[PDB]
Amino acid sequence: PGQFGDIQSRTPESKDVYANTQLVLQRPAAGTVHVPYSQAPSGFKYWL
Amino acid sequence: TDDSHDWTKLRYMDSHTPADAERAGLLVRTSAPCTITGTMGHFILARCPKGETLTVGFTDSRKISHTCTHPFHHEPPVIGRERFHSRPQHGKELPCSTYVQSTAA
């Protein structure tokens, strides 16, 4: 989790994808009609 | 100049003459231009970004912009433990202290 290769593919056209990110949902509140979730940290955008 | 209650005009002195201008004439900034909420009497209430200075201006009936600045360093204090960004979807309900819009205190 939280590393480049959290998501993985064998080709640029492989539809089969490996993922390890833990998009863990959270509780929405009164009026807050949306979906609250644990953000998956990227691999690239800090690995850059 | 006749003790009015309008949301258009505003008094300013000129050589023993109260003259009128518009609320769109005034403008406030510290780094970016602020946003204006409370307009009454001698008193103007805004919310404004992270401040080094303050600048206030308005424009004349002769359209000459009188705009002058005041030295004051503005930092909003933090609430909680997080030097945060703006008000998000996820909020925990932590106490704070704000002015209200009661025009007669």
Place this chain on the structure above:
Amino acid sequence: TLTVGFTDSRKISHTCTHPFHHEPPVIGRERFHSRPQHGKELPCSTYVQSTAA
């Protein structure tokens, strides 16, 4: 942050404000500000102005 806004036909502007940590990814080995006249050529990636996709 980020603000996007316009004015309606009722002459009442809306301005929505979203917290978004914009950070420019630094290109090359120089942490410059704006591309001047005297520059080299490095690979980078942008968006084209096409419509169909």
Place this chain on the structure above:
Amino acid sequence: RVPKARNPTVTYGKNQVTMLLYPDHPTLLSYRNMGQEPNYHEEWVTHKKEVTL
């Protein structure tokens, strides 16, 4: 309404714990013991950092 923080990833070692943690905005961290002493400690953090405890 104050923001909450994103839950960090965490794993364990034999009688210790490694916590890899992801901020976006400058955010505090603190920890203590529940014994007779607190051994209280704290750090500011701004970047995606790991810690051992």
Place this chain on the structure above:
Amino acid sequence: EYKTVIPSPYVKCCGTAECKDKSLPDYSCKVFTGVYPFMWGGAYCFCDA
């Protein structure tokens, strides 16, 4: 770089919805109770609890 996609969330008032298990890349589902949406005309539903 990945891409987190959620659709619009399902709402079951005067009822209690439940998931459907499906081999998705990091399938994550949850039903929440006691919620109360707000929209144009107040609550989207009629009852509350």
Place this chain on the structure above:
Amino acid sequence: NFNVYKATRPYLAHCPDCGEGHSCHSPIALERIRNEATDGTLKIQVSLQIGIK
């Protein structure tokens, strides 16, 4: 050229900061924000549509 938006209409949505400190339903609530290009360009997904009458 460019006739694909003949079944669209805007998407009134709860923007958390509509000015004013507190939140409101704006027709200009941002929904998705992409910046994956290395050249600092922000691709903004907004509710409403442009150009088409």
